[PDB]
Design goal:
Chain A: InterPro entries: Dynamin, Dynamin_GTPase, Dynamin_GTPase_CS, Dynamin_N, Dynamin_stalk, G_DYNAMIN_dom, GED, GED_dom. Chain A: Belongs to the TRAFAC class dynamin-like GTPase superfamily. Dynamin/Fzo/YdjA family. The structure is a homodimer. Chain A has a single domain (about 1-335), classed as Rossmann fold (3-Layer(aba) Sandwich), CATH 3.40.50. Chain A contains 10 helices and 8 strands. Chain A has helices at about 5-20, 40-45, 95-110, 150-165, 185-190, 215-220, 240, 245-260, 270-305, 315-330, and strands at about 30-35, 65-70, 80, 120-125, 130-135, 170-175, 200-205, 230. The radius of gyration of chain A is 22 Å and the shape is globular. The two termini of chain A are about 15 Å apart. In chain A, about 40% of the residues are buried. The interface of A and B includes residues 37, 152 and 186 of A. The complex binds phosphomethylphosphonic acid guanylate ester (2 copies), calcium ion (CA) and magnesium ion (2 copies). One magnesium ion (MG) binds near residues 40 and 61 of chain A.
Chain lengths: ~325, ~350
């Protein structure tokens, strides 16, 4: 995946939490928000690098998906588990995707209905960090199929339920073939995050822009400024989905497209850059937990050190406390790519 | 232009209005609504077939434009068409490029040059023997996040502005939605349903068919399988920004639209495109005319009976008017019995 960089950081952070006896902190949830069809599920699964989320035309995501990535230590290499099926273990990622669709139909029906009941999915991997990603239905305007008159408000409040959590990062997704000032994602992000401390803007579908136009002004922050960044991506077309085009090919073609059409900005756009940018934000959040961790170490070390003049297990736990203080310093000094 | 069919009917109406001394039947105003950039100004000017509206990327329409088409008689004729703005008093505009520029100029004066929006309309009349008497209203597009000079409540200011025009019961709403967006996200159809819940005066226009993602098309949308729209769902293809930059003509735009529909939507091609949008509007306008003939007829009788009384049951004026009103009555029946090709 393009988000493996934090693995060694979280591994040593775990070591500290194990030593100090505390429960490890939770990274913020990464939540995708935007108008229906803006490319949300495509963006979110690109952080995983495995195809597991239903994507397509019209209304697709019809329940929240709480996708918990769970790091697997030494204790198929990758596998999935849904809460609703209890213990069934999925090694086939196409089957995982199909089960999301199955579960969605079971609760939301087979005629465009939307339910707030979340689907809980765990993906176990040695190549993922402990991180929760949240896929959501897109905002809409006119009820279709089974949807009630107030479907727009039902969806919007569903989204707010997730992004009003102060420990969430918002991926505000807007299609490039729409005017940025019409971004429903950015409007709603600014309601819960008025100062842009936890909103990252993603501009999808660069490849679908009208001839004679481009997203240069948008991507240079000259339309709507967004503090944490505005990152352009090119995910698979419906034709590509139908033809089962791989992630590898999608990424290669995305890179080529940016080099061809956005050469001056290409190194600050694309899916790999999105992943790196999210890593930096997650690291920022990690560094804010460290003072809390620090004070804990200092109290327990003074507690073990008063126990002096049994004698080995307190002596080497004092050694393990010392190691934890240095690990904290290392985390603070760690550079990511 | 594609909306000349009603000319003979409105000439007949004018003969009656001239006799009756008032323009008793007013056609509904045609008002374009939709999200910013949905292609509204492009659709509206296509009903004129002359390139007078500013069109482009980003925010373009920033004041209402009340565009009054005024049919001109042969006696008032004379290279055959011109424009006048209320704000430039009696200045006559002969060049339609200059008319487009003046809309931009007058927008900049009141709305500024950093994306601001004003509700104050620009009033423009276009005089021509090739147009009917018809008011078209261009409006700013709906938005979400303030930019430039725009205030924090820009979205509501624009939505409320649109509502003021489309809440007029004597208006046909062109609800414009870009084809490269999901129909269920149509701000145009949402707002239209607030003033026209029953769909009696809302026509859905689906623009930018040419921009749809590979592996997708608007067949379901155009067949009414997504959101049904009683009066119709009509797909169009107007000029791209590259086309605007390359000065592509209206003639070529329409030919390419026709070709596109033939290639991509062959089964539906004859019920889509710009000419079909015009023909659909013509039918709606003719239905309003037919609805109002009893009023017009009654009004003739009010005058006829009156001049007959002044005719002892001045005299010469009464006699001429009675004959003119007799003619007017005959014209009414002809209009009623006219069916469009
Ligand atoms: N050409 C192109 N198509 C894209 C891109 N990203 C997504 N798509 C296409 O857009 C459609 C929507 O993709 P998806 O990721 O399912 O969007 P979504 O916003 O999750 C849909 P919902 O709002 O219902 O959940 C699909 O047909 C997909 O192939 C892109 O960058 N370029
Ligand atoms: N490819 C393509 N481009 C179109 C079509 N219709 C309009 N455009 C393009 O979309 C952009 C917006 O067109 P315009 O007619 O100004 O839309 P508008 O909705 O009036 C813009 P505003 O909301 O600010 O008034 C222009 O760049 C124009 O070339 C279409 O059918 N196909
Ligand atoms: Ca006659
Ligand atoms: Mg989705
Ligand atoms: Mg416009």
């Amino acid at each position: 995946g393009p988000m493996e960089a934090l693995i060694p950081v979280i591994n040593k952070l775990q070591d500290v939490f194990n030593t100090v006896g505390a429960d490890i902190i939770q990274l913020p949830q990464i939540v995708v928000v935007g108008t229906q069809s803006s490319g949300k599920s495509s963006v979110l699964e690109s952080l995983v690098g495995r195809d597991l989320l239903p994507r397509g035309t019209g209304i697709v995501t019809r329940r929240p998906l709480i996708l918990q990535l769970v790091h697997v230590s030494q204790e198929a290499e990758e596998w999935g588990k849904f809460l609703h099926t209890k213990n069934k273990l999925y090694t086939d990622f196409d089957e995982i995707r199909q089960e999301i669709e199955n579960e969605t139909e079971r609760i939301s029906g087979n005629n465009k209905g939307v339910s707030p009941e979340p689907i809980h999915l765990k993906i176990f991997s040695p190549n993922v960090v402990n991180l929760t990603l949240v896929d959501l239905p897109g905002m809409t305007k006119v009820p279709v199929g089974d949807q009630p008159k107030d479907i727009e408000l039902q969806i919007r409040e569903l989204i707010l339920r997730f992004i009003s959590n102060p420990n969430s990062i918002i991926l505000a997704v807007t299609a490039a073939n729409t005017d940025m000032a019409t971004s429903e994602a950015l409007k709603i992000s600014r309601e819960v995050d008025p100062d842009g401390r936890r909103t990252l803007a993603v501009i999808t579908k660069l490849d679908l822009m009208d001839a004679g136009t481009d997203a240069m002004d948008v991507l240079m922050g000259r339309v709507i400024p967004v503090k944490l960044g505005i990152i352009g991506v090119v995910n698979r077309s419906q034709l590509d989905i139908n033809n089962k085009k791989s992630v590898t090919d999608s990424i290669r073609d995305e890179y080529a497209f940016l080099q061809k059409k956005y050469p001056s900005l290409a190194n600050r756009n694309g899916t790999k850059y999105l992943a790196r940018t999210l890593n930096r934000l997650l690291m920022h959040h990690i560094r804010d937990c460290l003072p809390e961790l620090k004070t804990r170490i200092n109290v327990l070390a003074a507690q073990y050190q008063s126990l002096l003049n049994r004698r080995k297990e307190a002596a080497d736990m004092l050694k393990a406390l010392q190691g934890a203080s240095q690990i904290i310093a290392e985390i603070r000094e760690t550079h990511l790519w």
